Symmetry: C3
Subunit: 117 residues, 3 copies
């Protein structure tokens, strides 16, 4: 899966090693191997969330098969909010997540697409 | 709604308070409350737009219900171009927008999804 | 088309002029004019790819008409991997691509949408 986290927290208020811990977390939550989890963190941005510029973060999660339903995204959201709130020292009102299903033909890897792997 | 603005303008050529003004602007344009508008600005990037690396900006807008049609996106585009051209001191040839419909089951908030709120 | 490249390579390990060369490359690969190619490079990010925080890059490609099939995305992936591996001095295991079809009503340009141009 592919995780992208935007935050207006400066890099020095984003705890060291967060991207690796987020790989582990997403493995457990999503039921995917940690060695196929991709994480991108973009700190120090100018953000408003819910109209407010206090510290906040935006998580996008894209994956094949597992982020397409309300009922399991509810579970995923619960777990990622627990992880991120404590990691970033943010309240639940300062984080939002978006979920994006992908298909095999959309993912380029080793010079081909996953359709053929 | 969710706005993401990438620019190769350095942060010190992006006017202070732009993210809050963009919340207000997007409220009026999209017909959504300002306190549910999210803005992310990513300045100082390396960009080419239309093959050219002069100052430019890319706006992405994602929302439920209101960014799914050509006829209303035409109106939205008009208004956001007016706002951004003057805010960033960019010509209309240096900005592009992409619109992305979302569904309730895609948006994680307060540890659940909007399907259940 | 719209290209977005995230990398944990610091800006000073991203070769000068990469965004313009990527315009040219994407023109040839995708069969689109270079003057309608948009490139955004976001360097110096915190990333893990495949669970690993070594140098890596993520490419997103969005376009009308040409990134919707497995068979042609396989070709596109091949060409972009060749370009990026050598440009960024990254191995094929350190790059991934995602492809996103767009429709005319999604693209805001010159204050309208492409549906009407």
């Amino acid at each position: 899966p592919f995780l992208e986290l935007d935050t207006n927290l400066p890099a020095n208020r984003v705890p060291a090693g967060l991207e690796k811990r987020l790989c582990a977390a997403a493995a457990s939550i999503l039921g995917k191997p940690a060695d196929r989890v991709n994480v991108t963190v973009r700190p120090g941005l100018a953000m408003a969330l819910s109209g407010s510029t206090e510290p906040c973060a935006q998580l996008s999660i894209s994956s094949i098969g597992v982020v397409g339903t309300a009922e399991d995204n509810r579970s995923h959201s619960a777990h990622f909010f627990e992880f991120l709130t404590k990691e970033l020292a943010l309240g639940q009102d300062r984080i939002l997540i978006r979920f994006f299903p992908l298909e095999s033909w959309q993912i380029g890897k080793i010079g081909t697409v996953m359709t053929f792997l």
